[PDB]
Design a protein around this ligand. Structure first.
Ligand code: SRM
Ligand code: SRM
Ligand SMILES: Cc1cc2nc3c(=O)[nH]c(=O)nc-3n(C[C@H](O)[C@H](O)[C@H](O)COP(=O)(O)OP(=O)(O)OC[C@H]3O[C@@H](n4cnc5c(N)ncnc54)[C@H](O)[C@@H]3O)c2cc1C
Ligand SMILES: Cc1cc2nc3c(=O)[nH]c(=O)nc-3n(C[C@H](O)[C@H](O)[C@H](O)COP(=O)(O)OP(=O)(O)OC[C@H]3O[C@@H](n4cnc5c(N)ncnc54)[C@H](O)[C@@H]3O)c2cc1C
Ligand code: SF4
Ligand code: SF4
Ligand code: SF4
Ligand code: SF4
Ligand code: SF4
Ligand code: SF4
Ligand code: SF4
Ligand code: SF4
Ligand code: SF4
Ligand code: SF4
Ligand code: SF4
Ligand code: SF4
Ligand code: SF4
Ligand code: SF4
Ligand SMILES: O=S([O-])[O-]
Ligand SMILES: O=S([O-])[O-]
Ligand SMILES: [Ca+2]
Ligand SMILES: [Ca+2]
Ligand SMILES: [Ca+2]
Ligand SMILES: [Cl-]
Ligand SMILES: [Cl-]
Ligand SMILES: [Cl-]
Lengths: 620, 155, 619
């Protein structure tokens, strides 16, 4: 037979039947009607981007959400176009096409209520697709749009389809490489998805099951004028009558029982029925792209948020019931929702580890350590301490990952420092704690954590704050390194050549000559020991502050950061932000290129002069 | 240096100049013949099916793949004089920092400004090389002053 | 009209008609009967392996010869097998097959005297190929042997064919990359050429021309019993009769007039007729593989060396006449023989530059510089001085390259420091010349030059000798770097804390305290200035000698060499030799991997541990 890695997701019934895996195949050897199918042998045995875009393998919501920064604006509206409810989705697509915002719309049409994925470039053709098809739909028209050469498109999809398409948009951030190359050495040809319009969703059914159940009741599916889902029943409008059916009559797709997303939380704009009056559509705007709906329809406030939340809880309860049933019957479970949180990793033995983002300076409250200890004993997990002074709980089952993360979150222990983002800031005890400390490191680390913790970046980004030039936290090999420095100057009126300062200098930068002393500034590292330990107070502060380094890295290769200059705390925050902006602007390969690689490729001079230009522009 | 082979060692000179020509692939002309990967000493090229790619973290901009493509599928992405500063050899080796592409007028202005800032901050003549003065005051502080003086130049 | 880069070589008539270009194609889109031909469109337009193995694009003899280190042993012999002369080639192939030395023999058979390339695995089938075919032959059977999966084969060929096959064996050293990959992403399937048996050769003809000329004289080629070339005449043995024809009556292949190789000088063993009695074959053994012919036939001494040399000169005169004729008629000339010498490069404008291998220490005698000046003015060439203190003559025409190299060679100015070999050793004035010099650099450079000049390596190998730690010739970024060092120690009875030593120390490693002085050995570079300039002779030599570095380099990327230890001159020579041996053993990509890259890949510890083991075995 022909082996396909995604068969485990499909055969177990976890598969959402969204059809994202088949449209991304660069060899076109995958087809989708109501489930994915191989029409030819795959040389990779399915070890490719079909498996990597699957929302049921991994949701990848955490990495997508921190980048999309979704919000929630509730409205309801109706349009002149006759649709499932208020005809808002069609009115919005008509507006985007008419105002040249998209080259085409990816919509679901139908033939005898059998869903058909279509590419619509004209408004007149949009009206034929304005109605809910409760049978399994595909995203096949997105592949057609690509073959047509369309540049930008708007896609309407069920939460599962929106999730797979978001995984396609942010492919490198979770896949760790670029789009798969086909036999011709080129990636799949797909248009840019400019808008993702999500629908509220409780379930979908197999077309033949719907047809057979309707036939048994004496209803010809072709004769049906409209379908609707309300109060756990399927409404069928045929021959000017509403014939109600219990949803249990039809066979719900197994993947729907494993679904957690009711309102399509990752869509640019989510349109549904619940929470709004009949003949209107509920609208949840989540991004600036979704905001464009205000120009297509007249938005009205007064959405019933409680009705929408009731549906979210009913869907989550159904999901929890299905996961528990699979566990009790020893059925396969894909813990795809573990990627909804930060600091989650999979061990070599199949279990998980949960990384607590290291606290600033490695300082932990007894209550914080006690909570980690209680969780470890309750779940029989191993406790690991990381070299960034973080904590990891090893041996966690996929069934308990979410419970532990939310339990840790309640006590202020955020799970993170994992993935392509700003990792836990590493600081030494520094000033006030260490006798060698010259600057405060604990408050600076807290300021940096408050401003950049878990901030998305093309790849991991690590910051280190040292209290003195001994670099206990390695500022010279960090993306951004900070080191406290205090350079000396000799007061000849007070210096008597006692020779004590040369003894406290580890780098041996001092020369004792007769009744005076000197400093070799090509050797001096600014540890300030000679100022502190001079018994005659003959050594004074020449220069003082936070010395900054940029472009340092360790790991597979060592790259030494470049010494910039002394910076104030406000300058440091501005500098870290600008370096991240220029790093993101020039990064070409997420999860492969570190800051040092991007700086080297564009040039340190070109990179740093842009960082300076953006720093001057900063007004906040 | 006329190309990135650095026959005159631009990476270990107080100021180093190296000719560079970075490529870009024209997919309409590229047929995956595989000839460009053979002329690349750093092995930055990948031949895949009917096309070719370049790893820009490895590419040194020698332009051999543009010159030797029989189908003219490789074009000039970026071209010019790549500049390095703070390089040195002798008692110790110090690698110069890669700045950016510069025009001839920019290069002359840059060399003059680097000398002005070097002279302003040098404390020990006949002992401190540019690299030592840049390291002591900081590369960021040193180079941002060089840029400020370059902007002020009217001749 | 399929574009093919080698069409210029073929259409101009410079093409030797050897057929090497077609057997290397990994896509099998090239065919050869009497000339190369494309049976399908080439995506590279011939910019590939076919052009790179061509002996008429570049001979690549210099890089192949320094590696093969050919010698010359003259013998003549006869066997029981009936052949063209003594049947030595067939007797040797029969021995190699019988004794499991080769899986098959690549030989030229015939059908009505039309040559056919064959793969012979049976000693009995060899007899049918034992005669000279003066019509154009191919190397097509070498490709069939590869499809068959034969591991080792012996190949008989004309000098031009031997030259192309040597270029195939040493492909990366002149091509600068590995064998071309076909559409399936794999290189051509070819057996390993264990033996290259070369034939002496003056010319070959097109089959139809031979048949036509024979037909004019009432002779049917198919009826001919044997052919032979004697004293500028073609002997034709037909119906128990001997017919003599003048060679000028036949039309010589244009490529033969552009040929310089008479005795197949790059073959493992060369077999011919000239210089030996009738019924015997002359044998020139040049390599250890060629030596195996002593077990196949009874070798006899007494070859007429003057007769062989007369043919070499006649072929060279004919070559010079053809090159002059092309120049006068403005015909295309491929200066493929320029690669017979070292230090040759092609400029962007089409002319050549000749690099004189830098003299040790950059010291040149007036007689030497005057010669370079005379050549530059005679040929209106530009004089360039290199950063390794070498000389380059720019703007040389391909017609004058060989004359200038041989003229320079007579005055002791060898052309070199080019290609994958040991480049000119770079030394500073050092001891006796420079006031900072601590060790002698000129004699050490001369010793290193005498032991390793132009020695083949996987890639360029550069050595630098500095007289002191100021590293004017950059010992820290050279494959092997040598620096003179003199570390100080203070004599407290003589030191009075005058403070003079701290002033002469550039690294500021000295501390003056009261009536004494100290040295920071973490900063001290061993320049010895404090010993030399102490007015009270209070500083003495703690340690002295040549400090050695290894694995350094510059160019596309900078790699700092690793500081080894102080070494004696004999130790340095032993070390340089063993670093080259371990470098050659572990290098995988010639013309791409420098010593530093090979050391990094296998590990510095593992690499240097082996260098030490080999150094101990020398003693
Ligand atoms: C736990 C920890 C090691 C430890 O024993 O403490 C760790 C563990 C892993 N590191 Fe790391 N890294 C850890 C600090 C480091 C450091 C040092 C540091 O960050 O202070 C480095 C080099 C410093 C740097 O990157 O600048 C480091 C270089 C890597 C790399 C290669 C990075 C590179 O750019 O070359 C990977 C894989 C990758 O990025 O491709 C990696 C990836 C990983 C993964 C997640 C393997 C993976 O690719 O999924 C490891 C998780 C295994 C596990 O069971 O925890 N880890 N890793 C450290 C987590 C600290 C934290 O709480 O955030
Ligand atoms: C003439 C010279 C430049 C000069 O102005 O002096 C030179 C000229 C060329 N170098 Fe070089 N290199 C010359 C010294 C160097 C040096 C410095 C040295 O060796 O002292 C370097 C870097 C130091 C090193 O390699 O350790 C150097 C790094 C290269 C490279 C890059 C090699 C690498 O490993 O990265 C190439 C191309 C290659 O090898 O792929 C190259 C190749 C060449 C070629 C032959 C280009 C080519 O591949 O055909 C250039 C010939 C142009 C011409 O008209 O001469 N040349 N080249 C130098 C000849 C000195 C001599 O007599 O031998
Ligand atoms: C299977 C399914 C289940 C749903 N369940 C709920 C629910 O439980 N609660 C709730 O409040 N709302 C639910 N909805 C959403 C509701 O049915 C409406 O589609 C939504 O309110 C928008 O209606 P409208 O009149 O604004 O859009 P219209 O103007 O009617 O436009 C409808 C759009 O939906 C697209 N579409 C239709 N069928 C599909 C399909 N199968 N897959 C993808 N796109 C499709 C069409 O292409 C068209 O662009 C569901 C929708 C579907 C398809
Ligand atoms: C075209 C040609 C010109 C020659 N010119 C001279 C010359 O000017 N002076 C001189 O001294 N000797 C010349 N020779 C060599 C000479 O004719 C004998 O071939 C040689 O002395 C070996 O004789 P043998 O009896 O030992 O070989 P045999 O035992 O008879 O074996 C002959 C071998 O030659 C190979 N062979 C025959 N024809 C060709 C061909 N066209 N291409 C490649 N391989 C071939 C066969 O495969 C066979 O293995 C020439 C040979 C050829 C083919
Ligand atoms: S070719 Fe790639 S995308 Fe297509 S089925 Fe195979 S692994 Fe999946
Ligand atoms: S959930 Fe979607 S992407 Fe995953 S296997 Fe099923 S149809 Fe494919
Ligand atoms: S309930 Fe809706 S969003 Fe979830 S898998 Fe089913 S069709 Fe997809
Ligand atoms: S970097 Fe300095 S201040 Fe911080 S712990 Fe180390 S010695 Fe103390
Ligand atoms: S410890 Fe103070 S008084 Fe003593 S030599 Fe040093 S700077 Fe002068
Ligand atoms: S500040 Fe520190 S490194 Fe500098 S001279 Fe004083 S003791 Fe030495
Ligand atoms: S040489 Fe040119 S046509 Fe051939 S693979 Fe490279 S870029 Fe494409
Ligand atoms: S420009 Fe040079 S280094 Fe870059 S891909 Fe082309 S051949 Fe390689
Ligand atoms: S495929 Fe390669 S070897 Fe064959 S003709 Fe083309 S360039 Fe030459
Ligand atoms: S000389 Fe030989 S390799 Fe060159 S084009 Fe002619 S037949 Fe081909
Ligand atoms: S004369 Fe030269 S080119 Fe002609 S067949 Fe003999 S070796 Fe080849
Ligand atoms: S390396 Fe030393 S001995 Fe040689 S020229 Fe330079 S300063 Fe003089
Ligand atoms: S120059 Fe000589 S006597 Fe004077 S301090 Fe130095 S070692 Fe002592
Ligand atoms: S040998 Fe040279 S570097 Fe060492 S202490 Fe003396 S003057 Fe300084
Ligand atoms: O976990 S590592 O990537 O910092
Ligand atoms: O030719 S350069 O490498 O000396
Ligand atoms: Ca409804
Ligand atoms: Ca004869
Ligand atoms: Ca001192
Ligand atoms: Cl989902
Ligand atoms: Cl070649
Ligand atoms: Cl030849």
């Amino acid at each position: 037979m022909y082996e396909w890695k995604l068969n485990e997701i499909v055969d177990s019934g976890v598969c959402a039947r969204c059809g994202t895996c088949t449209i991304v195949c660069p060899n076109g050897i995958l087809t989708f009607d109501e489930r994915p199918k191989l029409i030819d042998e795959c040389l990779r045995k399915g070890h490719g981007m079909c498996f990597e875009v699957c929302p049921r393998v991994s949701s990848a919501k955490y990495q997508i959400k921190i980048r999309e920064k979704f919000y929630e604006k509730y409205y309801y509206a109706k349009s002149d176009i006759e649709g499932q409810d208020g005809g808002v989705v069609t009115a919005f697509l008509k507006y985007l096409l008419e105002n040249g915002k998209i080259d085409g719309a990816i919509v679901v049409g139908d033939e005898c209520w059998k869903p058909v994925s279509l590419v619509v470039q004209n408004a007149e053709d949009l009206l034929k697709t304005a109605k809910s098809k409760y049978a399994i739909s595909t995203l096949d028209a997105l592949r057609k749009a690509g073959e047509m050469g369309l540049e930008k498109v708007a896609v309407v999809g069920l939460p599962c389809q929106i999730n797979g398409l978001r995984k396609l948009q942010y492919f490198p951030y979770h896949a760790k490489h670029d789009l798969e190359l086909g036999r011709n050495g080129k990636p799949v040809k797909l248009p840019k998805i400019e808008y993702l319009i999500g629908l509220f969703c409780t379930e979908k059914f197999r077309y033949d099951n719907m047809k057979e159940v309707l036939s048994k009741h004496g209803i010809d599916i072709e004769k049906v004028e409209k379908f609707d889902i309300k109060k756990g029943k399927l409404l069928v409008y045929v021959n000017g009558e509403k014939k109600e059916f219990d949803l249990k009559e039809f066979e719900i797709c197994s993947g729907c029982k494993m679904c957690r997303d009711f309102d399509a939380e990752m869509a640019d704009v989510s349109v549904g029925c619940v929470g709004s009056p009949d003949g209107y559509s509920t609208i949840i705007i989540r991004t600036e792209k979704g905001e464009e709906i205000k120009n297509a329809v007249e938005l009205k406030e007064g959405v019933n948020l409680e009705e929408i939340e009731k549906l979210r809880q009913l869907k989550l309860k159904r999901f929890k019931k299905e996961v528990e049933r699979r566990r009790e019957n020893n059925e396969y479970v894909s813990f795809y929702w573990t990627a909804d949180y930060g600091g989650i990793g999979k061990r070599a033995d199949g279990t998980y580890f949960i990384r607590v983002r290291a606290k600033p300076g490695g300082w932990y409250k007894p209550e914080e350590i006690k909570e980690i200890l209680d969780i470890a004993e309750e779940y029989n997990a191993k406790i690991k301490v990381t070299d960034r002074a973080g904590y990891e709980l090893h041996g966690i089952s996929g069934f308990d990952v979410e419970d532990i993360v939310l339990r840790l979150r309640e006590k202020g222990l955020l799970t993170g420092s994992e993935g392509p983002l700003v990792r836990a800031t590493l600081a030494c005890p520094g000033g006030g704690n260490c006798s060698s400390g010259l600057v405060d490191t604990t408050e600076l680390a807290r300021i940096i954590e408050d401003n950049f913790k878990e901030r998305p970046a093309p790849y991991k980004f690590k910051i280190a704050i040292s209290g003195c030039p001994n670099g206990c936290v390695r500022p010279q090999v960090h993306d951004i390194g900070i080191a406290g420095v205090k350079y000396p100057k000799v007061n000849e009126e007070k210096c008597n050549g006692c020779g004590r300062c040369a003894e406290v200098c580890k780098v041996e930068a001092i020369d004792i000559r007769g009744e005076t002393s000197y400093t070799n500034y090509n050797v001096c590292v600014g540890c300030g020991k000679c100022i502190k330990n001079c018994p005659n107070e003959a050594r004074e502060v020449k220069e003082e502050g936070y010395l900054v380094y940029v472009g340092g890295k360790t790991g597979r290769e060592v790259v030494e950061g470049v010494k910039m200059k002394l910076m104030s705390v406000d300058e440091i925050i501005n500098f870290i932000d600008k370096v991240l902006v220029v790093y993101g602007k020039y990064a070409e390969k997420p999860q492969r290129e570190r800051l040092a690689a991007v700086m080297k490729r564009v040039g340190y001079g070109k990179f740093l002069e842009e960082v300076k230009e953006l720093m001057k522009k900063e007004i906040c």
